[PDB]
Amino acid sequence: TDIPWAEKRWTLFSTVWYLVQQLRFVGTPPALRYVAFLGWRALMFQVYAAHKALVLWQCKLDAGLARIGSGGATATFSKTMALRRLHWRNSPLAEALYALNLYKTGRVHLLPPVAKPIPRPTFFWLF
Amino acid sequence: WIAYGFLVEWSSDFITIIPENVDIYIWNVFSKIYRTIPLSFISTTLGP
Ligand SMILES: CCCCCCCCCCCCCCCCCC(=O)OC[C@H](CO[C@@H]1O[C@H](CO[C@H]2O[C@H](CO)[C@H](O)[C@H](O)[C@H]2O)[C@H](O)[C@H](O)[C@H]1O)OC(=O)CCCCCCCCCCCCCCCCC
Numbered sequence: 001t002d003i004p005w006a007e008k009r010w011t012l013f014s015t016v017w018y019l020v021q022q023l024r025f026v027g028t029p030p031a032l033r034y035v036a037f038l039g040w041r042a043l044m045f046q047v048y049a050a051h052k053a054l055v056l057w058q059c060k061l062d063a064g065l066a067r068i069g070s071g072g073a074t075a076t077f078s079k080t081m082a083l084r085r086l087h088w089r090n091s092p093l094a095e096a097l098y099a100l101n102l103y104k105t106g107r108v109h110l111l112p113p114v115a116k117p118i119p120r121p122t123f124f125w126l127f
Numbered sequence: 128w129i130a131y132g133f134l135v136e137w138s139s140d141f142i143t144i145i146p147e148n149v150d151i152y153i154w155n156v157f158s159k160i161y162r163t164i165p166l167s168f169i170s171t172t173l174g175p
Contacts, residue, residue: 023165023166023169028166
């Protein structure tokens with residue numbers, strides 16, 4: 001009932017992509033879809049554990065860069081920024097700006113703005 | 128006897144004296160047979 005009209009656009013790319021979705025849903029057996037779904041679930045759990053470890057290491061790097069830049073006083077790290085990295089709410093520019101900010105003035109609890117969601121790209125009748 | 132024995136069948140439109148059950152059965156058999164055609168075509172053409 002609340003489909004955005006940008007997702008109901010008919011284009012050449014969506015015409016091609018209907019074939020992929022049709023082969024996925026009515027062209028491939030649900031048994032093979034189920035075993036592929038289980039494999040993708042296990043792989044996504046593994047990559048989530050990897051991303052969580054990477055975020056914890058980025059917290060340690062946050063503390064290191066916050067010491068080199070404020071001398072030795074500020075050595076903590078922003079837990080809100082840790083959750084922001086974990087929830088993918090940060091742009092790479094925001095990450096670089098925050099890291100540089102730590103490295104040369106400290107200020108752990110001064111955070112970059114949250115990145116807006118990326119809108120769906122549209123190019124006329126192409127996509 | 129010919130009434131029951133091949134007159135009311137030979138003189139009637141065969142759309143009338145044919146259940147929709149056999150049409151549904153033949154369509155189901157056909158659609159079950161030719162169901163792997165997209166995946167098999169993709170596997171043949173995307174192979175070596
Ligand atoms: C206990 C049972 C023993 C086996 C069970 C587990 C062992 C092995 C699991 C499968 C093999 C390895 C899978 C790893 C990657 C997944 C493959 C894939 O591309 O990804 C598959 C995706 C994932 O499933 C769907 O995926 C959807 C879309 O998400 C993802 O979809 C894609 C994932 O490829 C993209 O990555 C995309 O970015 C991402 O969003 C949903 O999110 C859900 O996760 C789910 O509905 O499916 C799809 O779209 C495609 C549908 C058809 C593809 C079939 C591929 C493999 C089929 C094996 C059949 C052999 C039978 C014998 C059994 C032994 C198994 C080897």
